[PDB]
């Protein structure tokens, strides 16, 4: 999900 895409913030 887009919530898991948060890893891109890292």
Swiss-Prot record:
GO CC terms in record: extracellular region
Compartment(s) where it occurs, according to its Swiss-Prot or TrEMBL record: Secreted
Keywords annotated in UniProt: Amidation, Neuropeptide, Secreted
Bridged cysteine pairs (disulfide): none
Sequence positions bearing Methionine amide: 10
InterPro entries listed in its UniProt record: Tachy_Neuro_lke_CS
Gene Ontology biological process: neuropeptide signaling pathway
The organism's place on the tree of life at top rank: Eukaryota
Family from the record: Belongs to the tachykinin family.
Free-text function comment from the UniProt entry: Tachykinins are active peptides which excite neurons, evoke behavioral responses, are potent vasodilators and secretagogues, and contract (directly or indirectly) many smooth muscles.
Name assigned to this protein: Neurokinin-A
């Amino acid at each position: 999900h887009k919530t898991d895409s948060f890893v891109g913030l890292m």
